[PDB]
Amino acid sequence: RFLKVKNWETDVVLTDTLHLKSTLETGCTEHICMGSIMLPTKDQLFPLAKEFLDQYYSSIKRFGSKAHMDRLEEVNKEIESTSTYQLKDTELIYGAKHAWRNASRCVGRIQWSKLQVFDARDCTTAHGMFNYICNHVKYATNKGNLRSAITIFPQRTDGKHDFRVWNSQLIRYAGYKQPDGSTLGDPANVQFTEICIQQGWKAPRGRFDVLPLLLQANGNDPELFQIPPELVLEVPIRHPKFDWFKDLGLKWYGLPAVSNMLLEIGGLEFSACPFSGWYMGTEIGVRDYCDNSRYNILEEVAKKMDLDMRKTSSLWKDQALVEINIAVLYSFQSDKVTIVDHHSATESFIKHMENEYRCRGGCPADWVWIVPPMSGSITPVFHQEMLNYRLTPSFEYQPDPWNTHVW
Amino acid sequence: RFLKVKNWETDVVLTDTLHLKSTLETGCTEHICMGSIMLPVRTKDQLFPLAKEFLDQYYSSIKRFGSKAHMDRLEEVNKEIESTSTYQLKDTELIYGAKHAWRNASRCVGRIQWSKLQVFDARDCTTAHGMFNYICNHVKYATNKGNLRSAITIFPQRTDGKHDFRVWNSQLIRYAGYKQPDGSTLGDPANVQFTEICIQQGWKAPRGRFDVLPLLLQANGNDPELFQIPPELVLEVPIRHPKFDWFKDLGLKWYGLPAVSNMLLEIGGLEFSACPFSGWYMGTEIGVRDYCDNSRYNILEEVAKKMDLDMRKTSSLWKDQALVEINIAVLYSFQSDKVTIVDHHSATESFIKHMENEYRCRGGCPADWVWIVPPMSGSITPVFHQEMLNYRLTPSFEYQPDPWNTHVWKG
Ligand code: HEM
Ligand code: HEM
Ligand SMILES: Cc1cccc([C@@H]2C[C@H]2NCCO[C@H]2CNC[C@H]2Cc2cc(C)cc(N)n2)c1
Ligand SMILES: Cc1cccc([C@@H]2C[C@H]2NCCO[C@H]2CNC[C@H]2Cc2cc(C)cc(N)n2)c1
Ligand SMILES: C[C@H](O)[C@H](O)[C@H]1CNc2nc(N)[nH]c(=O)c2N1
Ligand SMILES: C[C@H](O)[C@H](O)[C@H]1CNc2nc(N)[nH]c(=O)c2N1
Ligand SMILES: [Zn+2]
Structure with a gap:
């Protein structure tokens, strides 16, 4: 016991x-x-x-x-x-x-x-929700000194009268499926992006398009709003040693903010x-950039590094993975946006x-x-036994509302 | 269901x-x-x-x-x-x-x-000497001059449960560990305790960084006895790096045959x-765990030092950089000597x-x-994204507590 x-x-x-x-x-x-x-x-x-x-x-x-x-x-x-x-x-x-x-x-x-x-x-409409959200984004961002x-x-x-933020995060990039077969932007968001334009979003059809908020107030059909661009702090990604890195045209946002729970x-x-709160570096560098189902840029990066991609055992994936992550940390640190490395976290x-x-x-x-998605055993949490159990009060994942909701 | x-x-x-x-x-x-x-006792x-x-x-x-x-x-x-x-x-x-x-x-x-x-x-084995010979033939057949089976x-x-056969080694081939009076360790800190039992039992220790331990073998519930595996039977690989010529002068080598004996x-x-x-090693068991665990050979600092990485801030990811390089070296060394090994991507x-x-x-x-999931580069391997169910089927391999804790000494 x-x-x-x-x-x-x-x-x-x-x-x-x-x-x-x-x-x-x-x-x-x-x-x-x-x-x-x-x-x-x-x-x-x-x-x-x-x-x-x-x-x-x-x-x-x-x-x-x-x-x-x-x-x-x-x-x-x-x-x-x-x-x-x-x-x-x-x-x-x-x-x-x-x-x-x-x-x-x-x-x-x-x-x-x-x-x-x-x-x-005390909120009662989606416009109200929008206003509360912008104020949250701004207070939290705090010009890079995240809170x-x-x-x-x-x-x-x-239960017929729920408030919901349709977006899974307040700030995420759009994804569109192309005629040539591939995916432009973030493949995690094709579905939500499609619902945005289907509700009337003027998608720029670019690669790093900050999505519009979709807010449901009082169980009503949800509505569209663009977060003021000047409130979304973004970071362009550069390497402290690889001068060609910038040319991939990589940026990410400073503020991770989960909104589906x-x-x-x-x-x-x-x-x-x-x-x-604020990001642990590996979340952008390992997952957002390197996952096969995400931006999937290892191949591109290894190439620019002139690494032997002929065989898996040259560990080119691993070598490239690290540099991509060094770059995410350096960029955020240079632009003075709070970020934490996996060793420190x-x-x-x-x-x-x-x-x-x-x-x-x-x-x-x-x-x-x-345990972080890279370098697990050199971080101390790898070696730590943990017990997992559910206490209240709690956060719980909930289903994407579109699957559910009727108009 | x-x-x-x-x-x-x-x-x-x-x-x-x-x-x-x-x-x-x-x-x-x-x-x-x-x-x-x-x-x-069933x-x-x-x-x-x-x-x-x-x-x-x-x-x-x-x-x-x-x-x-x-x-x-x-x-x-x-x-x-x-x-x-x-x-x-x-x-x-x-x-x-x-x-x-x-x-x-x-x-x-x-x-x-x-x-x-x-x-x-x-x-049909009845004595420890019998166990030694069985184990020698196993090592030799398994090694197969580098083409592991x-x-x-x-x-x-x-x-x-009063007459158990046990191999007191946790693996048939492992390196000794010696605690120094200043608090540091020479060789593999994981084997200090077992090294001491060996020494207490009569082994004359070379006291180097890579001394292959002797087998300690219990037959029929009897006290165990020491045996030295014939060195010609212990295949080893000196560790070197494809681009970094200084890597060899770290002095590292490792044994080719991963052989679990405590289950x-x-x-x-x-x-x-x-x-x-x-079986045969996956490269990360040597390069990540054996060399880079803080409680093991712990060569990260030394490798990053020689790589002249920036070590003032963990956020340079210097530890991560040194890790990959060491793991490149392990795979390169094994492949070059034609000793079977598998990298974590392929495995x-x-x-x-x-x-x-x-x-x-x-x-x-x-x-x-x-x-x-491997202890480096987690999510760039397909297993990271795979949901798995864990449950227990027989036949099975189970963990056993170390025999020195339970054994009744006979004299
Ligand atoms: C302040 C810096 C913070 C750090 C460094 C951090 C760290 C993290 C990380 C790395 C994850 C994994 C997320 C993923 O893999 O998608 C996570 C998940 C989570 N965190 Fe935090 N966190 C922070 C702040 C917060 C705050 C403010 C909350 C809520 C008040 C929170 C609650 C959660 C919850 C509920 C999850 C699980 C989310 C899910 O199931 O998708 N964290 N945390
Ligand atoms: C053929 C090449 C093999 C590879 C590449 C391989 C891979 C691995 C690795 C990397 C581990 C984890 C090591 C650790 O964290 O301590 C492991 C664990 C294990 N393997 Fe294998 N394996 C191989 C063959 C075998 C064989 C022949 C057996 C027995 C017939 C076996 C049974 C086990 C068991 C029981 C464990 C868990 C050990 C424990 O709880 O300490 N494997 N395997
Ligand atoms: C508040 C805070 C601090 C630091 C970092 C974050 C990052 C933004 C959080 N990550 C968002 C990416 O989330 C995806 C990937 N990990 C599980 C998925 C979400 C998810 C999916 C499913 C099916 C279940 C579940 N519980 N979470 C947030
Ligand atoms: C057959 C084969 C093929 C390839 C690799 C192997 C690897 C070499 C074997 N690893 C030995 C080092 O083992 C320590 C570290 N990982 C679990 C611990 C042993 C252990 C400890 C505890 C408390 C429980 C348990 N089940 N195993 C084996
Ligand atoms: C606490 C935790 O269960 C422990 O560190 C585990 C984690 N994963 C592992 N995975 C492998 N293959 N071998 C190990 O020894 C461990 N150790
Ligand atoms: C199936 C597996 O649980 C899944 O890929 C997990 C693994 N660990 C993770 N860890 C974090 N922090 N976030 C994730 O999304 C996941 N995904
Ligand atoms: Zn469980």
Whole structure:
């Protein structure tokens, strides 16, 4: 019932007790492990509400106190009467931060307590959503000195009235399928891009076209808006030693900001809750540039480096992969946009695991997502055993709305 | 029941039915995943069902399920278990069982090769000297002057668990480690403890950076005894780099034969506690782990120094640059000497084809993602994007605690 995690590099052993507060199902049984799988009523609500408020009042050193019980009562009366309830601001800030703290797939949680929360619960239209979003983008970007933030729109009601940001991230590049057969821009977005023009976007049909936001307010058909160009901070990609690099015409955006997830606090569901921090270098350099299904530029780069591409064992993919990543780090650093390397990020996360075991009795961590997609075993997280379990408040992946929604 | 795995690069979706034949526990629950935890005397009562499952499997595979031959063998094994409380595998059973332990090993990326395995039956062995000779012939046949062949040697099964055969080495060929009084280590820090046991047992240590350890062999539950593998039998490759002429002066070399000797082989409920097996290396096991783990030879600093990389900031990716170069050197050195080796690109592509063939032909392929994805260049290999199900089939290879912890010393 109490569980050990060992680091095989340092021999440090940690004891996890936090997992018995785990509630949700993980996808694994005694018979099958699904560690590597990407997607494994009034009655139901008050347990959830109670459980959250209990942890809330516990964290403010006020468990079992008058203010505590009074709130539990107020919330109970409200559920019994209205079919749901409203979070107080303090609870909302606590909820959001803890959802980040519980995010087992996030390497950057050392930062979890420094999260600016924008309460957009008074929002009522998509124009309103647009306005809240621009302000988020601008506050977070901060001329390159990036700041963690989240913006929280109205919670689920009867479920026919959801708020949703159709985009998967606030800022992403367009993708178009061409007559010659290939793909221009980002192949991850062909589908969404198509829906954009189908709803009326004047696509420039270029390679690095910042997509338009598609916002659904109050379960209504979604609407189009361009983020003011001057709010999207982009970085042109150059190498500190390879002068030809620039000529590939590579840029990326400074602000990673995930906008398809669902935040669950005390059993209430916030379906639109874009959040943003700052990039770990490998995310652009390894995944966005080098994935076969993405920009897929290894071949081009290896060529310019005059490497032996005749056989896999010359490790030309690997050599090129590293330089592409050196270039992403250099560029962001030279233009003074916050970015973190995988060595630094994973080191910070180990320090953070130690803190969470010391101070909380554990840290849910998903090793498959935490170990970077390059140079795994030279980073310390490779050698660290992790327990993965689901705590609330949480972030949850939700299905692309277009698959669902009717017009 | 059905279970789907998707590949996120190709969108290819596979369907696993084989997990339905899964027995042992994983260590995971509906509330906790332990997929990244390294580690998550048998009664008559429990043995006949395990013999029965296995022989049902064996006879299905040779297309004789339900034959007289099958039914007679069931009855015969039933009888041995009744009378002697264990049983003996036929040669054909042992061979099939050893091949399947490999096939079922979910942490092994090399399984496209599972059906080409040389089985050396050493179940007539009685002494450590006998074990030494069996092991020598294994090393020599497996090496084959650089053209490596997969092989396994199987010593007699557990009886009362008081008479176990064990190879105390974790691999047949490994380098010594020596802790210095200043706190540093000479040779392989991974083998310090075992090196000490060897020294305590009588070995005269050369005290160099690349000393091949002596075998330490237990037969019949007896205290183990030391033997030196004939040096002419230990094929080694000096490490050099194709463009960097200074690389050779680092002094590195490595052995050609990866041979795991610390695992327990389970077949039809029988336990084979000494069963060293060997294949050939994937380059990253040497170049990433052996040389670049901080707890191992740890040559990163030294390589980047000589490369004159900028080492003031981790964000120069100097560690990453040195890593690739060392791994280029390993593959180059092995290929130049005609010693079998496989790079991680080729090994993972081959594994993905094996996996797909396995889903078509068998209804699944249990796979441990954490172990199968290489420890460098993760996502530029096709396995990174592959969903995998991990579960446990028999026959199988299981981890054993080191014998020096459990062994009853006789004197
Ligand atoms: C401040 C710097 C941050 C760093 C360096 C960072 C690091 C990362 C990385 C590298 C990933 C992998 C994403 C992928 O592979 O697509 C990730 C995932 C994630 N992070 Fe963070 N994070 C940061 C801030 C945040 C914030 C502000 C939140 C929410 C408040 C958050 C919550 C999450 C969640 C829920 C995931 C999983 C997303 C998914 O399932 O696709 N992180 N984190
Ligand atoms: C033919 C060439 C082979 C290649 C390229 C290969 C590849 C690998 C690699 C790279 C590992 C992980 C090494 C580690 O992290 O310690 C591994 C693990 C393993 N392989 Fe293989 N393999 C081969 C042959 C074999 C053979 C002949 C067997 C037994 C018949 C085998 C059974 C295993 C087992 C049981 C593990 C997990 C070991 C553990 O838990 O420590 N493999 N394989
Ligand atoms: C807030 C923050 C900080 C640092 C970095 C980020 C980067 C932007 C986050 N990455 C976006 C790319 O996301 C794709 C790739 N990894 C899983 C997919 C998204 C995804 C897909 C599916 C099926 C499930 C799931 N949970 N996530 C975000
Ligand atoms: C047959 C064959 C072919 C190719 C490569 C091999 C590689 C050489 C074998 N690797 C040996 C070093 O092994 C350490 C490091 N990876 C797991 C540990 C051993 C280990 C430790 C623990 C706690 C559990 C476990 N199951 N294995 C074998
Ligand atoms: C199937 C496998 O889980 C999938 O490719 C994962 C692996 N690890 C990952 N890790 C991160 N951070 N992000 C990802 O998108 C993935 N993809
Ligand atoms: C903690 C974690 O399970 C451990 O470091 C694993 C990760 N992946 C591995 N993969 C392989 N092939 N071999 C290993 O020894 C390990 N070690
Ligand atoms: Zn699991």
